[PDB]
Amino acid sequence: MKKILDSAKNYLNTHDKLKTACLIALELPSSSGSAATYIYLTDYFRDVTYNGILYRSGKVKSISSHKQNRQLSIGSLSFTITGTAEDEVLKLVQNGVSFLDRGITIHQAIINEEGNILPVDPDTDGPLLFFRGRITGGGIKDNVNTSGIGTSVITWNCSNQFYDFDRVNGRYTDDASHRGLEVVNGTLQPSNGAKRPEYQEDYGFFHSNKSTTILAKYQVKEERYKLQSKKKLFGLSRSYSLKKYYETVTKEVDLDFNLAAKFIPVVYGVQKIPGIPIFADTELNNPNIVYVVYAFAEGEIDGFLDFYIGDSPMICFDETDSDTRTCFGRKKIVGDTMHRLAAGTSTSQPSVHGQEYKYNDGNGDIRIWTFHGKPDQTAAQVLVDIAKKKGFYLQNQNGNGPEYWDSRYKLLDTAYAIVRFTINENRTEIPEISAEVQGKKVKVYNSDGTIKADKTSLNGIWQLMDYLTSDRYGADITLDQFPLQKVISEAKILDIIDESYQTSWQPYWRYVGWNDPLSENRQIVQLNTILDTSESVFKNVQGILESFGGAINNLSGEYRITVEKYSTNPLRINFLDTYGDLDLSDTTGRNKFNSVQASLVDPALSWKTNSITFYNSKFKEQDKGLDKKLQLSFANITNYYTARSYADRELKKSRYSRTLSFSVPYKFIGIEPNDPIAFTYERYGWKDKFFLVDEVENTRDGKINLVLQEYGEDVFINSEQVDNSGNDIPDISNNVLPPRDFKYTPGELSWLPSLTNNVVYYSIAHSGHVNPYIVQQLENNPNERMIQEIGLAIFELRAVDINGRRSSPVTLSVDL
Amino acid sequence: MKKILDSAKNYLNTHDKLKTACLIALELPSSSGSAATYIYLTDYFRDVTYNGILYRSGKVKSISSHKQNRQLSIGSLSFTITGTAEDEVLKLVQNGVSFLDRGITIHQAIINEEGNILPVDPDTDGPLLFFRGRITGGGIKDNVNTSGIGTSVITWNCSNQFYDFDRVNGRYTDDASHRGLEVVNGTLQPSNGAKRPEYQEDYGFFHSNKSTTILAKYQVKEERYKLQSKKKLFGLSRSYSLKKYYETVTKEVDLDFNLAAKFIPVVYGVQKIPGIPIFADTELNNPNIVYVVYAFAEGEIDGFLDFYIGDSPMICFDETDSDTRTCFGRKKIVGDTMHRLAAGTSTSQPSVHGQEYKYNDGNGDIRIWTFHGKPDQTAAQVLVDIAKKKGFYLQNQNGNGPEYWDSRYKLLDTAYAIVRFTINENRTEIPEISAEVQGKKVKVYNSDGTIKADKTSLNGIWQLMDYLTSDRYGADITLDQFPLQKVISEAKILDIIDESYQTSWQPYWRYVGWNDPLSENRQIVQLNTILDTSESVFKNVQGILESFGGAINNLSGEYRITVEKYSTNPLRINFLDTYGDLDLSDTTGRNKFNSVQASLVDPALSWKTNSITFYNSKFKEQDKGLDKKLQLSFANITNYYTARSYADRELKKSRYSRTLSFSVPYKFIGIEPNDPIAFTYERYGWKDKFFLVDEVENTRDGKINLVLQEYGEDVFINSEQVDNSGNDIPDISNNVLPPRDFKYTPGELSWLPSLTNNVVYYSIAHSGHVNPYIVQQLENNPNERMIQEIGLAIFELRAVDINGRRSSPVTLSVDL
């Protein structure tokens, strides 16, 4: 809906002969860089002046139609400026000019008797906006027929901001791609022309080419040059088939040849992402400590959360993981994070910047230095101080002074986590570190004008708009093209409370992505997003739109992010009003279903795929007892219950599946592709019947070519679901188990064999005996006790596997 | 550019009424095999007789248009022979005949007043060629309307040599596919109908089905039935998106189910390729020695170069690799290859056929016999002699006499490498051998007529020429369809010296692919390509064309491989000459870019992907400070610097991005789809403006339908580059390192623990003590010394990991 005013509504209803005029505020293709110079053309005939400039009226023969469906579709127009005007043709074909950018603004001025009749609320009462886009256009077509009249038309094409649909805006993890190295002057590379000059001086990605090999030195044979995939289980969109779709999903990516893995992700909410090994080296005079800088996400994270030192996280999943290895906090009920590690008291709080120190299970001292992104942040005093002492191995191997790391080695917008290992004989290899990262600071607006962009990383269209209004990783949209009021309205539409489940049965309340239990948190579409910035802007934005359900629609010149909705105030379009043509198209054979299957990245499965399925006794009995399953995978939703409700809603949406296609007059201007209307064609039997538009085609003439979708109340009324809490699937099975029992009987043999069946020799560590004891599993009997020979001594029992993993030391402080 | 002669130029300018006639020299569809019988049809009306045959003039109502752009596009025509001629329809529908081949040559004879006005320089002064292609044609269309007129036309289709665009012409590695086994007579396979009879008697891929399992016996659990990918990082061509494209790139292929892995690659220049295991066995009476024949590339390699015994090459990268393991030659400055290994003196020379023997790092004796391809080569006396002694295990296991290997077991065009292992307790498994192979015998022609072939694999259109004029793996093109002078001209265009970088700073001068430092070697587009013959002829050829930049174009009947160029002698086409239409299309939105990114398989990264990126201050300021990055990946270029210059050129080419489309009269015949013209439309302001044509559509009528592309001199002028030599990334991280220090102090304790934390037990081997000692890493302290107990004894220290790798033995010959 565009409001239009009651005055303009009355004029459109009564006057019945209205003189439309288009106000094209073109921006001239300019070379060499300067201030923007605008040529103001209008179609009309006189010279229509609107708030200042004349808007000359000697060109622009015609304007194309602005067709845009409920799918982001590079919405494109095309001028027809006469090719007999020397000025425009010269400006088009001049050598040197480049016009990738350059806004075009079109106003459809409804001329009054004397000068525009003032529609549009809270924009100064002038013409309706019509395009407000960028210019990506062609050129001349000359005909010069030898018989007679020939034509010559300049066809400026112009499209939405999402032109060049394969644009891949992302910051990468290379120094050259981070501060924009150039080859100006003779042979040196200054730092010019990169995203914000702060990056130009951000000398912090310089050692990133060689770090991967340095880690491959201290790493397992299999996981060499190998990260996990930064985005797993992307959204199914009917472009795939289930077998092919699930084949494309890969758990690990080969960093050696795949450079797309180096692109820095964008994470909203709470989600597990792998860490890119930016930096790697070992301390001098003690070359077992390894310093690794891991880049995870993009600017100003809420906080790092529960690092992964392998496939065993620091905070145990359930009493099951509590029993297997030594973990300090719990996860199912209570939201213990790394802050619990830092403080020692059970807390539910993200990492508070530079202090989330040592994680110590019996193996090695893992000191992790966690840093968010910031508009102004400085490198850790750890790396800078150690480089000042010149205590890095590769420094003196190459001969680098106090410039290997320095105060100018910042990392301005990224989520980098300096990780320190202590690789003893007890942790043989550096594992593959991933982490759970909580969100990106989405500017959350409020109907009031108080902007909350502080910690939140909310869940809704706020995420999409933040990805849209970001220079660094999004697509420049300037944040002035959005109307804030309806954006807030649709965001409030998203977070309508879902009285289906309860917060009591959400075990992992925290890692779904809501803080603080008691508060409501039961919101429809609580999506948690990974946006790997290596795919494309077009595809990421359409992925988010498919996730929450909606479309971006620059129809009235503003982007106006709409969502699916039900409301008691629709437009009452009667067939007599519209026009004559009325197409009905039941795509009912292929596009409606009786049961749905979904796919989540469930935190209740240690971020592993989980399946939700229904069946319906009403639906299948309606069909004829035919089995037909909708198939789905939710790339962005991690809460089991909200994904379940969303699957039910999309199932019923499929169940409706009716399309109308007709054309309405200029009376109904302002319609956007998610506005409710009620059709009342009397022959059909249709008295008010809820439809949501799917296409709007604004035409230069004035008619609108609508296309409808059939959406009853049942899809939005939502259903009631059963709790799923006991069916948790912790990832217990990635660690070798410790001795089951242990006591000293005056042997120290009481250790029962580890349940992990591939163990070769246990290790015993005395207080004074420098040489550890070795007992070997020559025979493996799960109920049997093997013996050691042997006061105030401390003891450690680490089971060793055929790989050397070592299991959480069970320690006894006994008196001999 | 076809020269067309001054006489023909004058006639086309003056006469203004010219009687065109087409000379169609069809080749009759013939069955059962015989000499070619040609029907000579012509369009005209009388009987136009050119150089012998009378060219009957009673058929062929019309001929289609010959359109071909800067993309090899199966350039196709279509005859229309009257279907009322009994002879032609009978030859069409006769059952038994096949015409897969059969040349069609069309001459557009410009009839003089009395008999053809003698154009075409060099060809007998006769008419221009028009098609010169092969016939892949359709058939009748009858109508016989009951009302009246009915039509009947024979639509002979005919297309370029690259018809059947999914042909997979390649040699593969099986006995039947190597010598064409057939099923004639009772119960024996003869060797008939294969590429040249020398393969028919080349009985040398017989033991190829079972070799892979024989190695899988002596091989790691992971690399079992697992080769690397013969072509890594193929060319991005906008058909892919970055994420999908980089995901498709796979480092290893599963040989068990992937039979495309067995196809023999073709390599030009130096590049790393894996070795297909076409043979494997062990000696009797001593079954530790393993004999493996590894097929690498095709005929007449310049030489094998730096074999790989794993991920650790024989020739160390830098002092870094020199320190880790024991490797003899250097690579980053000096070009030490396996010939250094054989001779013992630092050399830079490819393998000299069958003698590049033992590589001996302390572990086992790696005896490698290297063979090139050759039109007449014989199997080594090694395999034949051992088979004569009948000392192969599987021989007497199965009961095979002196025919398991024999002088008949040649490999008459293959780059095979008889590799001998000595699997001791010191090299537990046979590793996965890959290697670096130098090129193909490319026939390099010279303006003089002296063909230099055998010598070097060059880098240019000569590679594409060899791939085109090869019966074995290319597409039969007979080498008579090419005009040698234009090909030599284009090759000289490619190798114009790039005064951007210097040879002083290209570390791996040799392993890029140019021999002998001092010489120039600074050439634009030094592509070093891999052509796996399992993809297709069409896609491989377009791969080379996208690599160096160019197109294959048979408009004038000759393939005429053009490349992009700038020249001061263009054609001066004025709009008044053209006709009436003049299209213009600025795809500035999607096809104009500011920053480039590239992907190379550098030899300065042990053949691992590397990223070159630019930012440009002029361009981004020209746009509006809008970041839109061109993305590239060079599959064929291994120079950092030449790929850098190529990325700059292609970025600027994208920056220009203008297309014209118009038609010109027959005066301008000969225009070729990559020729320079200067278009001078007066109104646009366009005085001479350099365009390279993108399309040429020769028409039966005479008009030519050109399409232009805008390339200013800035793309060809090229720019300067920065030194990049210190930023090398050798693969140090693929081997276990030995003890850091070692000396004997009057026991042997001095060995400092290996930097590899994957260490279990060191091994000490005395001169007389049969049983080696074991010192175990019960505690790992990087600065500590552990002890052995214990004249004229020899010592060896091999660190052992949890896998059994073993390091390079550190040895002291001390007196106790």
UniProtKB/Swiss-Prot annotation, chains A, B:
Induction: Expressed in the late phase of the viral replicative cycle. Ubiquitinated by the Bil antiviral defense system when this protein is expressed in E.coli MG1655 strain expressing the Bil system. Keywords: Late protein, Ubl conjugation, Viral baseplate protein, Viral tail protein, Virion. It is found in: Virion. GO terms for cellular component: virus tail; virus tail, baseplate. Its main location: virion. Forms the simplified baseplate, together with the p132 collar protein, the baseplate tube protein p140 and distal tail protein pb9. Closes the tail tube and, upon infection, opens to form a channel thereby anchoring the tube to the outer membrane. These changes allow the tape measure protein pb2 to be expelled and phage DNA to be transferred to the host. Also forms the start of the central straight fiber, which is continued with the straight fiber protein pb4. Homotrimer. Forms a pseudo-hexameric ring. Interacts with distal tail protein pb9 and straight fiber protein pb4. This is Baseplate hub protein pb3. The gene is D16.
